[PDB]
C-alpha cells in the first residue's frame, strides 16, 4: 500500500469507478472538462497507480477524502 496526500485522492474520490482503469479512463476522458489544477494533480497521482493493480487500488478505496468535509460539507 503506497501514501497519497489528501488533493490527490480526493482527486481520485471525484472519478473513482471500475477500479483505477475506469478511474483512468473516466479522468483521462475528462481532461479538457477538468480545471487546469486538477489535471495536473491528475497526471502526478495516475502515475502513482501507474505501477498498482485493481487489486492495490481497491486498498486505498479512497481514504484521504474525509479531512476536507469539514471545510464546507456537501449535502449527502
Known amino acids: 500500500m503506497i501514501r497519497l496526500t489528501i488533493e490527490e485522492t480526493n482527486l481520485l474520490s471525484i472519478y473513482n469507478e471500475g477500479g483505477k482503469r ?3 479512463e473516466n479522468i483521462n476522458a ?3 472538462f477538468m ?3 486538477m489535471r495536473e494533480l491528475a497526471k502526478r497521482t495516475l502515475a502513482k497507480i501507474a505501477p498498482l ?3 492495490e ?3 486505498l478505496a479512497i481514504f484521504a477524502a474525509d479531512e ?3 471545510h464546507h460539507h456537501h449535502h449527502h
Open 35 to 37: 480545471d487546469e489544477d
Open 53 to 55: 493493480t485493481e487489486n
Open 68 to 70: 476536507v468535509l469539514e
Open 57 to 59: 487500488y481497491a486498498e
Open 30 to 32: 475528462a481532461l479538457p
Open 22 to 24: 475506469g478511474l483512468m
